[model samples]
Target chain A: DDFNNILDLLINESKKAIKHNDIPVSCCIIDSNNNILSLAINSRYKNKDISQHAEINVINDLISKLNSFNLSKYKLITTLEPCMMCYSAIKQVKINTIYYLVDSYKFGIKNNYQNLNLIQIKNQKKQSEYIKLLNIFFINKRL
Target chain B: DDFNNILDLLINESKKAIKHNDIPVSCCIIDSNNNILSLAINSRYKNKDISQHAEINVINDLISKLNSFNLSKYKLITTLEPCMMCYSAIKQVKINTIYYLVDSYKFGIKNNYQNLNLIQIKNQKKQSEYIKLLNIFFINKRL
Candidate 1:
């Protein structure tokens, strides 16, 4: 019933990075019972750390918040499908389910991730809006 | 002339993880001039963060040490060929050259990384020793 609410939360999280001049990707970790565990935005540029992808940030934050690493019961939701690195982390932390809007042309590879439940939501309204924001970010970087 | 010393340093760094019950993977970062920038051992089990691969750890540590993250001019050396996640960070950080001993049967993929140079050193002596350490770590993890 609150699927729109989740998508809205994702957009809000993704928007946080624009102020930092980093990529607008974002993610959140939630438990099976729908409790929020952690939320993060891409900070690779701002933090100068390559592993600061939204999914990796949230997963690491979740680990720090919980004081333990194993996250087999957690579910992750991202504005974009995870890259090879984030998927590696998803597999590492044993996060079994992932939901995202839009796909990562550079990093989303489904062949190697059949073991996990990967769900892609169709949200044309926000997806288009988000893609435009990304284009805007990179367009300036090129100029 | 100093190749033996580098491998010894990696072994020494990786040994730090055994006391923490973490995997024995280790890595160091160096500039083109062979000046060591950072060294790290895996702390996944210890830090409870799944992204704590040795390569990732050293890269992150190097960023903190340098106060900046563009590692395009740097080279990375690791005990084992890095996993997909570390490679992703390698590409993201723009670290162009990588040298590693042994192969990662689990995480090494060659197809996706045609743009970078991934060198696998043929050192059988230390390779066998490191492989046995990994097996020993996993053996107890199973029990």
Candidate 2:
């Protein structure tokens, strides 16, 4: 079921961040073919290991788990910086369309990542549900 | 005029951060009686000084300067962990109420500045205005 897949992805990423040694990652759920479904993360985990770092691994994990689904014609967007490791890993998997909250230093830093050619991406979505979530998060912070 | 004030505060803080060799700071505005009003800041400033550290001084500056308005009550709210210098200034100046959207690490750590109470103020603006402005300022960064 779509709900089951998304729920599983979100929960797994949450657990991974809770246990991650380095930066924490935020996870967005997409269908087997890379359609964005939903996003989940604890707001209090700003900075430190609780940031959006492990997203590449989570996405790769999701994709790998669902080998029956091909990602040739889909895109994935995120609200945090995807670390270098994820970028390289995703490239190896030939999964492109990795959008991020901002243009990442990691991307520039690892310009030599051999398989980086496979990635395609976009910036903040014009009518994004995640953007609305981000605005709400900032509003909660300001208010 | 309110919009201009927001711009001025954000720009001034941006300059201050450059001068102090600290990370860019985010500033929020509140009234003398402890009600949050508005917040505006540059998006590039993402170091330690941005959130918690600057929040202490920024709030104090607001409280000290804003008191001249002769309003019956107004207070400044901050999200990040505030600094001791600002806390001391706040205490010495007798500005008691510091509304916080985030945690108070110094209070928990040093046990000083207990005289100046920390309050949590929420929902002062209407939902529509809140949502509307939140979308406005938040999108200033493409995130």
Candidate 3:
């Protein structure tokens, strides 16, 4: 039922848009079994592009959502940081395991989550450049 | 108007879900009154605060938006370091006069925008914090 818990959390968190109601939160949930669940949107941001803060939101949201789900004995892997939002949201919630797809020592240290693990994912820069090109296309389209 | 424009950009950009799907970009625009116009976003790897980036993005976006709208009467101001994304976005959109809101020459020299009219804005402490927060990346070897 981890997937169901993740699905419930993902669906609930998406409704809580940015404080000003301008940017809706995007949610992604990947269970230990490799099940990916998401809510809010599946395409480009409504008007903005990818950003660091949004990435933080993605990580934070996943962590907070994890608190709501059953993580009895599962490792969660995320491609980004657990946004400060997640840190504050779950200051009281306990998560046993977290595996960041990339290593962020400062974030881990600041949050005091020593149990967190990082994996070295390859081809990330190439992905960054590819995304940049796509966004440039989006930027031009907006122009 | 400030809240609304910020909201629109956040909404639009949030939808892109860049890393969730590998789409990333930087956007800038200006209004007729020469105020910042839209939200800005960058790669998550940059390890930055999104809201702060959005504020800076507003400054650059407002400048660029000026050219697209053909509003040439007002000068623009920025409150932080203009990242490569800001420079690239503004140049692409054709913004001419931008008053950088800083006193630091190092960033200007590095970006090769040294000719830009550098004006000293009050509140240096807050500005220093921005650089400090980002410098952690350099110490960690993430950059």
TM per candidate comes to 0.84, 0.27, 0.28
**Predicted candidate 2 versus true structure: per-residue lDDT over A50-133, tens digit per residue:** 112445335434554554234444445444545443453344345555654433443234322332333323422322433454
i-RMS, each model, one decimal = 2.1, 17.1, 10.6
- Output the lDDT of residue B121, model 2: 34
**What tens-digit string does per-residue lDDT give for candidate 1 at A1-143?**
23467777778778788787787888898887888879888988787777788898899898888877778888998888888888887877789888877776633345343668888777778777667777787787778
- Candidate 2, residue A85: CA error in Å? 1.3
lDDT score for candidate 3 against the true structure: 0.39
- The runs of at least 3 residues in candidate 1 whose Cα sits more than 4 Å from the true structure, single-residue gaps closed, are A65-68, A106-113, A140-143, B65-68, B106-113, B140-143
Residue lDDT tens for model 3, B1-143: 23334334433463353443212333344456545445565433243322234333454344454433332443334434455444433333344555443433533344433323334435445345434533443344443
Query: Deviation in angstroms for A70 in model 3?
Result: 40
On TM-score, the stronger of 2 and 3 is 3
DockQ of 2: 0.01
Give the candidate number with the greatest DockQ: 1
Candidate 1 CAPRI classification by DockQ: medium
Tens digits of lDDT, candidate 2, B15-44 = 443343343334565564424454533222
Clashing pairs in 1: none
| Residue-level lDDT tens digits of model 3 in A16-103 | 4333222222345355565654233212133342222333344335545554333334333333344433332222223444433334
lDDT of 2 at B95: 54
- By TM-score: ranked, best first: 1, 3, 2
lDDT of 1 by residue, B1-143 (tens): 33567887897778789888887888899998888889888988787777778998899898898787678899998988887888888877889988987676743354344668988766777777777777887887789
